[PDB]
Amino acid sequence: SLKALINGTIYTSFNPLKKVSGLVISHGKVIYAGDSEVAKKIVELSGGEIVDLKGKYVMPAFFDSHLHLDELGMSLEMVDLRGAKSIEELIQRLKRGKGRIIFGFGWDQDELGEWPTRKELNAIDKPVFIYRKCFHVAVANDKMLELLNLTPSKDFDEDTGIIKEKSLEEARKVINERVLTVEDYVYYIKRAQEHLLDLGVKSVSFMSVNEKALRALFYLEREGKLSINVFAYVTPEVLDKLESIGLGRFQGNRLTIAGVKLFTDGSLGARTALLSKPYSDDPSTSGQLVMEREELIRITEKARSLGLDVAIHAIGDKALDVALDVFETTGFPGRIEHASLVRDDQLERVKNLKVRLSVQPHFIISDWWIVERVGEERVKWVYRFKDLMKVAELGFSTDSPIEPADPWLTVDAAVNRGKGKVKLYELTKDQALDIKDALHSYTYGSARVSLASDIGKLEPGFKAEYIILDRDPLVVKEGHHHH
Amino acid sequence: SLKALINGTIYTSFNPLKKVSGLVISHGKVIYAGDSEVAKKIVELSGGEIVDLKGKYVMPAFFDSHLHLDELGMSLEMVDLRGAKSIEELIQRLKRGKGRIIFGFGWDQDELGEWPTRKELNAIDKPVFIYRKCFHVAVANDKMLELLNLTPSKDFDEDTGIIKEKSLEEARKVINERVLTVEDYVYYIKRAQEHLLDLGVKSVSFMSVNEKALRALFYLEREGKLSINVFAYVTPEVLDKLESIGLGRFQGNRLTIAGVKLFTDGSLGARTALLSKPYSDDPSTSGQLVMEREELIRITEKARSLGLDVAIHAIGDKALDVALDVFETTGFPGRIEHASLVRDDQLERVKNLKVRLSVQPHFIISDWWIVERVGEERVKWVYRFKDLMKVAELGFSTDSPIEPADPWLTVDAAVNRGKGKVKLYELTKDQALDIKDALHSYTYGSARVSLASDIGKLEPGFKAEYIILDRDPLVVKEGHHHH
């Protein structure tokens, strides 16, 4: 169809700020951006729909440059056990849960009075698997333990049903590869995309797409049931399978086979992020390197032989050195995920290697313990978005479901930096972004970081991914957007 | 870019005949078809290029619904040994050949005076593999035989270098899977597509895409070096590998993973096509079934589980029964390739199952021996294109490089049926098509047969694949098209 959007205020770009009064759209792409009367005239001659905006505002849709579509779907279906004050309350919540397997999250023995147990969870006549708050421990009943068939170890207590550390790593792998079916993944991804679409997020980079998530994505693409643009960054294990048929970058209608996702380190919360000096609240540790340079380089080169992008998780400042070493050696300006701790000296190296950065501003709000982890002397390195925007293309993301998916909450985090919420604000005030730069990062910034060359602006040649607002987005309080 | 094609005669459809004077094209798609002044006005308002046709004619580009892109590339690079009158002449031709391995075709011992031999071909300091006329026998030198490492049998004479029957089948498999590299396939496909593009063929169904051809296609697609639309029909072996990642129908920019290609029988020339009664010139044989129904159904269902199309080769009339049995049982209206012999009773079954047909009219010209194979009593079943067009969507193709790729030669074959060239004309006069129906079959007919829903017409919504002609294509002698 050929359509015009007329008689409204259409933002086509944020950096630089450009507004028009009329758009012409042909087959999902903008072909004219300018005067409202010209737009209407074009569509009158051609034949087609003329949409009266009636003074409403139009902006490019949000692009979340880093999330987990399958995990978001699971999270939306999970039983919420946060704030449960007794085993009784916990069992009552789990009994209301729907589906083949009852997944839950968020319980805390401090709230409950005691740990939940395998025996207590046997009262639910379904496999039950429940994550503790912070997702480093889980408890399972008999039926779920039968499905999991976990390797005996000290990290798996068979009597109490408590699964932690590497046994939890095993349990997650088994759930993701064996227990869940492709049909489950289709269901989870459908749920996630409808949630995102309702929030105005119309494009994503889906990180760590595994074998079954990829099968689900292919299914949804061929059925025309993918409702958002998905840039798939596969696991190394999936990359091996792509290589076996020679499938590299491939852009479909909604699905793009985009890249591979790699890890250098863990997280600051668990103290597994790799630092150049020990943790300030644990001087015995400096974090944990997940993969060595040689293996990271090998996977990067395999991906590059297929024209695929390479995204590397690096939270700690030493992990960033490792990630930058990989990109320097391969001569590929890749993307770095998180970039949570960046030293003053690393800013110029980021600039010189021309790397892309995907950051998650809502982590400022969630990670209240950050200054305890890194100390005051490293505070200036923390989530330094204003500094990073100067040296690299910067995209915004939520890492959903780790943070809420609502883009306005992440915009607020970047603009206001946890003012009145967390210690970090007072210490890092000068890193606050203005609303224009935040919206740019969450639209065109995210698209560029994801190598989506026709997304992020509403200028001619770009995909017509837009959202319609009642008010000027630059002028509304972030937490006050409706419907 | 937004462009207008104005001041010309643009055929947008052949059945029914529709002409306009102006087209507007946006991002490779037609968005307006109509008056020349309206088209120019649209592009003036929008901004963009206005192309003056200066009275020239425009038609949808040809769509060859069945060819072998890799084999066409190889054929164009091969040494032509047709008409070589001595071993001396043959060696002289092969010495002028370029490349790592010297491939040749078309020699005949009747022209040469004698068979060529391994020893004689040792005079060329490269691996040499030379097909006899009709491609059922080949001869190879020492170097090529080293590369091939063929299994000892009666069909492989190691002293003379003569390879035939199942040893030739082995040699071809080894060449295609092991001897040729992906880089060779990239080179062959590039050569083929430039040849086709120069002929006005802008879309193809590429049949029996093997593992390395698929790798090459993926490479060309990601590099943006595919210059024609390619609908890939993979081998069953490749289909297994698609299934391993869940890759089904997938439409990229130029490359579509479209389907799987299956075989019921052989060919009438070799008397391997499967007939319901013995051959008229060999009463001892009725042809040869390549694959049984159960296996054909299994592969069809595997493909259908991935939303992939299924194309079945059926030349003989009994082979057609087998193909129709597969489509009936699976409940899938698939496509049949060739449909060379169709009985009066099979016409209604074709109609009822709603199958698509890809036919090759130039076979009328090449297959001079056809009436000897099938006899006069089966002549009415032969290449009955007018009858078939009444009961099914019909696409035209060349099966290149088996026939010449020039679409005008195939148009002529359908319209004139070998008048003054072969016996078949006088016997099957009434099956001749008019030029409008031939052009329709070679554009929209071929697209529909290949499930290319946005190719084949120059109406709004369709891809702008067109060719520019000096004259009205409906009014020019077929063999008289220039440049």
Distance CA A360, CA A292 (A): 25
Question: Three-state DSSP class for B216?
Answer: helix
- The token pair at A283 is 């001087």
Nearest to B252 among A45, A219, A250 (CB): A250
Question: Three-state DSSP class for A334?
Answer: coil
- Whether B455 and B447 have beta carbons less than 8 Å apart is answered as yes
For residue A341, CA distances in Å to A291, A377, A384, A431, B412 come to 19, 12, 8, 13, 71
Nearest CA in chain B to A305: B219
CB atoms under 10 Å from CB of A434, counted, come to: 12
Distance CA B60, CA A238 (A): 41
Domains of chain B, start order? 1-60+457-483 (2.30.40.10), 61-78+181-456 (3.20.20.140), 79-180 (3.10.310.70)
CB atoms under 10 Å from CB of A44, counted, come to: 12
How does DSSP classify residue B359?
E
The residue among B229, B128, B239 whose CA lies nearest residue B443 is B229
Q: Does A45 sit within 8 Å of B42, measured CB to CB?
A: yes
Return residues 219-278 of A near B (CB < 8 Å): 219, 221-223, 238, 241-242, 244-253
How far does CA B152 lie from the centroid of its chain? 34
Q: B292 CB contacts (<8 Å, ≥6 apart)?
A: none
Instruction: Calculate how close chain B gets to A24, using CA atoms only, in Å.
Output: 9
The residue among B261, B405, B390, B279 whose CA lies nearest residue B337 is B261
- The token pair at A307 is 């024209």
The angle at the Cα of B254, spanning B252 to B257, to the nearest 5 degrees, equals: 55
Q: Which residue has the tokens 């060919």?
A: B267
- Whether A424 and A382 have beta carbons less than 8 Å apart is answered as yes
Question: Three-state DSSP class for A83?
Answer: coil
DSSP states along B421-458: T-THHHHHGGGPPPHHHHHHIIIIIHHHHTT-TT-S--
How does DSSP classify residue B341?
B
Q: B362 CB contacts (<8 Å, ≥6 apart)?
A: B398, B403, B404, B409, B410, B413
Distance CA B268, CA B288 (A): 10
Instruction: Calculate how close chain B gets to A455, using CA atoms only, in Å.
Output: 15
For residue B34, CA distances in Å to A25, B9, B20, B44, B456 come to 20, 10, 5, 16, 17
- Whether A260 and A235 have beta carbons less than 8 Å apart is answered as yes
Nearest to B248 among A38, A218, A250 (CB): A218
Query: HSE (CB half, 13 Å, CA atoms) of A178?
Result: 11
Is the four-CA dihedral B318, B322, B328, B332 of positive or negative sign?
negative
Q: Which residue has the tokens 């070589």?
A: B84
Distance CA B23, CA B39 (A): 6
Burial class of residue B339, CB neighbours in 10 A (0-12, 13-18, 19+): buried
Distance CA A104, CA B270 (A): 67
Distance CA B479, CA B303 (A): 40
- The token pair at A87 is 């085993």
CB atoms under 10 Å from CB of A119, counted, come to: 12
Q: Which residue has the tokens 């003989």?
A: B316
The angle at the Cα of A409, spanning A405 to A413, to the nearest 5 degrees, equals: 125
Distance CA B136, CA A187 (A): 53
DSSP states along B360-429: -TTHHHH-TTHHHHH-GGGGGGBT-HHHHHHHS-EEE--TTTTS---HHHHHHHHHHTTTTT-THHHHHG
How far does CA A446 lie from the centroid of its chain? 11
Q: Does A250 sit within 8 Å of B218, measured CB to CB?
A: yes
- Whether A61 and A455 have beta carbons less than 8 Å apart is answered as no
The residue among A399, A447, A406 whose CA lies nearest residue A67 is A399
**H or E segment at A218?**
helix A211-222
For residue A378, CA distances in Å to A56, A318, A383, B108 come to 45, 13, 11, 83
Is the four-CA dihedral A73, A74, A79, A81 of positive or negative sign?
negative
Return residues 171-190 of A near B (CB < 8 Å): 182
Contacts of B244 in chain A (CB under 8 A): 241, 244
For residue A302, CA distances in Å to A309, A328, B247 come to 11, 16, 20
Q: Does A307 sit within 8 Å of B222, measured CB to CB?
A: yes
Runs of H (alpha helix) within B12-164: 36-46, 69-77, 87-95, 109-112, 118-121, 142-148
Chains A, B: CB contacts under 8 A, how many?
102
| Resolution of this deposited model, Å | 2.0
The angle at the Cα of B464, spanning B461 to B468, to the nearest 5 degrees, equals: 145
Strand partners, B260: B234, B310
Distance CA B73, CA B191 (A): 5
Q: Does B253 sit within 8 Å of A211, measured CB to CB?
A: no
Cis upstream peptide for A278 (omega within 30°): no
What is the dihedral angle through the alpha carbons of A212, A217, A169, A315, rounded to the nearest 10 degrees? 150
Distance CA A246, CA A186 (A): 25
Distance CA A209, CA A233 (A): 6
Distance CA A70, CA B258 (A): 27
Distance CA A144, CA A142 (A): 6
Q: Does B27 sit within 8 Å of A246, measured CB to CB?
A: no
**H or E segment at B34?**
strand B29-34
Distance CA A342, CA A357 (A): 12
Looking only at the bridges linking them, the beta strands covering A137-140 and A162-164 are antiparallel
Question: Three-state DSSP class for B464?
Answer: coil
R_g of chain A, CA atoms, integer Å: 23
Return residues 277-306 of B near A (CB < 8 Å): 306
Q: Does A252 sit within 8 Å of B250, measured CB to CB?
A: yes
Nearest CA in chain B to A43: B42
Question: Three-state DSSP class for A90?
Answer: helix
Query: HSE (CB half, 13 Å, CA atoms) of A298?
Result: 7
Return residues 418-477 of A near B (CB < 8 Å): 460-461
Q: B346 CB contacts (<8 Å, ≥6 apart)?
A: B317, B320, B321, B324
How far does CA A314 lie from the centroid of its chain? 14
Question: Three-state DSSP class for B314?
Answer: strand
For residue B237, CA distances in Å to A45, A202, B308 come to 51, 37, 14
For residue A167, CA distances in Å to A181, A234, A480, B340 come to 21, 24, 43, 63
Task: Classify the phi-psi angles of A72: left when phi > 0, otherwise alpha if psi is within -120 to 50, otherwise beta.
Answer: alpha
Distance CA A69, CA A185 (A): 9
Query: HSE (CB half, 13 Å, CA atoms) of B145?
Result: 21
Question: Three-state DSSP class for B262?
Answer: strand
In a mutagenesis test of the A interface, which of B1, B3, B26, B254 is the best target, namely the one with the most A β-carbons within 10 Å?
A: B26
Q: B272 CB contacts (<8 Å, ≥6 apart)?
A: B265, B266, B287, B288
For residue B217, CA distances in Å to B221, B306, B311, B451 come to 6, 20, 20, 19
- The token pair at B34 is 């109509």
Angle at which helix A317-330 crosses helix A293-304, to 10 degrees, equals 50
How far does CA A356 lie from the centroid of its chain? 15
Distance CA A68, CA B410 (A): 53
Nearest CA in chain B to A47: B32
Q: B133 CB contacts (<8 Å, ≥6 apart)?
A: B82, B105, B106, B107, B108
Runs of H (alpha helix) within A115-203: 118-121, 142-148, 165-174, 182-198
Nearest CA in chain B to A44: B42
Q: Is A307 on the interface with B (CB under 8 A)?
A: yes
Distance CA B287, CA B313 (A): 14
DSSP states along B130-150: EEETTSSEEEE-HHHHHHH-P
Interior/surface letters A355-375, b for 16+ CB within 10 angstroms, e for the rest: bbbbbbbbbbbbbeebbebbe
The residue among A146, A147, A119, A144 whose CA lies nearest residue A131 is A144
Query: HSE (CB half, 13 Å, CA atoms) of A481?
Result: 20
Distance CA A302, CA A156 (A): 36
In a mutagenesis test of the B interface, which of A25, A42, A235 is the best target, namely the one with the most B β-carbons within 10 Å?
A: A42
Is the four-CA dihedral A91, A93, A95, A101 of positive or negative sign?
negative
Distance CA B464, CA B461 (A): 9
Solving technique: X-ray
For residue A178, CA distances in Å to A76, A172, A250, B395 come to 21, 10, 27, 45
The angle at the Cα of A143, spanning A166 to A72, to the nearest 5 degrees, equals: 60
Angle at which helix B317-330 crosses helix B293-304, to 10 degrees, equals 50
